[PDB]
Amino acid sequence: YFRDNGKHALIIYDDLSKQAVAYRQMSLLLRRPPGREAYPGDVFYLHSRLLERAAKMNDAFGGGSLTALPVIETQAGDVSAYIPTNVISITDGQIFLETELFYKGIRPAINVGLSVSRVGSAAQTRAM
Amino acid sequence: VRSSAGAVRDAGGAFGKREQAEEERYFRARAKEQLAALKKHHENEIS
Amino acid sequence: ATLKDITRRLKSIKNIQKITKSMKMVAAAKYARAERELKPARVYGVGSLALYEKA
């Protein structure tokens, strides 16, 4: 609504790894056949159709925007898991938080080595 | 299960980072020395 | 960890073990040579110290 009415919005799904679990429970109780790790087949779609709504409308469509900051939770840093990889291949950037950095005193634990942002140059003030 | 060449730096454990640093420090030193020699040659070859 | 983590770690440790075995062999050869060369130098140096402990 906000992005369609020329305003700017920010949405923070927290977590998406629990929406995936709720969807899996629904799908298993409707008797739909399971998939990998028991998640339904349509588990990528579930998220891709959801994170694709965070657009940046041009000035003809109001100019409004909707940023999204999905939060995923990995297991012992296994970024290679199923839902983490799906959402990593869906989103633009990433912000890797690591426990080894959290306890080494670096807080926020952002792992600047791996953290990425496709926009990069653009969307940054000239001084910064 | 076997082992292959260039596996210590594929794991990326402690030995991988240790080796990467042991290489980078040495080659930074040698690059500094070579750059100094290059500057000296530049100056000595102007005439 | 996962299977790939364990596989990579196992391969790395196997390489490390191979390298340390080779280095043990090299060090043993160099040790044998060093002992061989140390005997005469042992007598020579002990002689050179002779004076101070005698006077």
UniProtKB/Swiss-Prot annotation, chain A:
Tissues expressing the protein: Heart muscle (at protein level). Heart and liver.
GO MF annotations in UniProt: ADP binding; ATP binding; proton-transporting ATP synthase activity, rotational mechanism
Which subcellular locations apply to this protein?
Answer: Mitochondrion inner membrane; Cell membrane
Q: Which GO terms describe its biological process?
A: proton motive force-driven ATP synthesis
Q: Which residues carry this modification: N6-acetyllysine?
A: K7
| A Gene Ontology term for the protein's cellular component | mitochondrial inner membrane
Reproduce the UniProt comment on modification after translation.
Acetylated on lysine residues. BLOC1S1 is required for acetylation.
**Broad class of where this protein is predominantly found:** mitochondrion
Residues bound to Mg(2+): D14
Report the residues modified as N6-succinyllysine: K7
Write down the position(s) of the site called Required for activity: S115
Keyword annotations:
Acetylation, ATP synthesis, ATP-binding, Cell membrane, CF(1), Glycoprotein, Hydrogen ion transport, Ion transport, Magnesium, Membrane, Metal-binding, Methylation, Mitochondrion, Mitochondrion inner membrane, Nucleotide-binding, Phosphoprotein, Pyrrolidone carboxylic acid, Transit peptide, Transport
Q: What does this protein do?
A: Subunit alpha, of the mitochondrial membrane ATP synthase complex (F(1)F(0) ATP synthase or Complex V) that produces ATP from ADP in the presence of a proton gradient across the membrane which is generated by electron transport complexes of the respiratory chain. ATP synthase complex consist of a soluble F(1) head domain - the catalytic core - and a membrane F(1) domain - the membrane proton channel. These two domains are linked by a central stalk rotating inside the F(1) region and a stationary peripheral stalk.
Q: What else is known?
A: The siderophore enterobactin (Ent) produced by enteric bacteria binds Fe(3+) and helps bacteria scavenge iron ions from the environment. As a consequence, the mammalian siderocalin LCN2 plays an important role in defense against bacterial infections by sequestering iron bound to microbial siderophores. LCN2 can also bind iron bound to endogenous or nutrient-derived iron chelators and plays an important role in cellular iron homeostasis.
Family the UniProt entry places it in: Belongs to the ATPase alpha/beta chains family.
Q: Which organism encodes this protein?
A: Bos taurus
Protein's gene: ATP5F1A
Curated annotation (Swiss-Prot), chain B:
Q: Where is this site: Participates in pH sensing?
A: E19, H42
Q: Mutating E19A: what's the consequence?
A: No effect on F(1)F(o)-ATP synthase-binding
- Explain what the record says happens when changing R25A: No effect on F(1)F(o)-ATP synthase-binding
Provide the effect of Y26A.
Strongly impairs F(1)F(o)-ATP synthase-binding
User: What effect is documented for mutating A36V?
Assistant: Strongly impairs F(1)F(o)-ATP synthase-binding
Where do the record's region annotations for N-terminal inhibitory region lie?
1-20
Q: List the disulfide bonds.
A: none
Instruction: Tell me the compartments it is located in.
Output: Mitochondrion
Domain of life where this protein originates: Eukaryota
Explain the purpose of this protein: Endogenous F(1)F(o)-ATPase inhibitor limiting ATP depletion when the mitochondrial membrane potential falls below a threshold and the F(1)F(o)-ATP synthase starts hydrolyzing ATP to pump protons out of the mitochondrial matrix. Required to avoid the consumption of cellular ATP when the F(1)F(o)-ATP synthase enzyme acts as an ATP hydrolase. Indirectly acts as a regulator of heme synthesis in erythroid tissues: regulates heme synthesis by modulating the mitochondrial pH and redox potential, allowing FECH to efficiently catalyze the incorporation of iron into protoporphyrin IX to produce heme.
Q: What is this protein called?
A: ATPase inhibitor, mitochondrial
Species annotation: Bos taurus (Bovine)
Curated annotation (Swiss-Prot), chain C:
Q: Which residues cross the membrane?
A: none
Give all N6-succinyllysine modified positions: K24
Please give the residue positions where the record annotates the modification N6-acetyllysine. K14, K30
Where found in the cell?
Answer: Mitochondrion inner membrane
Could you say which protein family the record assigns here? Belongs to the ATPase gamma chain family.
How this chain assembles, per its entry, is: Component of the ATP synthase complex composed at least of ATP5F1A/subunit alpha, ATP5F1B/subunit beta, ATP5MC1/subunit c (homooctomer), MT-ATP6/subunit a, MT-ATP8/subunit 8, ATP5ME/subunit e, ATP5MF/subunit f, ATP5MG/subunit g, ATP5MK/subunit k, ATP5MJ/subunit j, ATP5F1C/subunit gamma, ATP5F1D/subunit delta, ATP5F1E/subunit epsilon, ATP5PF/subunit F6, ATP5PB/subunit b, ATP5PD/subunit d, ATP5PO/subunit OSCP.
Q: Could you tell me what this protein does?
A: Subunit gamma, of the mitochondrial membrane ATP synthase complex (F(1)F(0) ATP synthase or Complex V) that produces ATP from ADP in the presence of a proton gradient across the membrane which is generated by electron transport complexes of the respiratory chain. ATP synthase complex consist of a soluble F(1) head domain - the catalytic core - and a membrane F(1) domain - the membrane proton channel. These two domains are linked by a central stalk rotating inside the F(1) region and a stationary peripheral stalk.
- According to UniProt, the name of this protein is ATP synthase F(1) complex subunit gamma, mitochondrial
Q: Which organism is it from?
A: Bos taurus (Bovine)
Of the parent protein, the shown chain spans 26 to 80 of 298
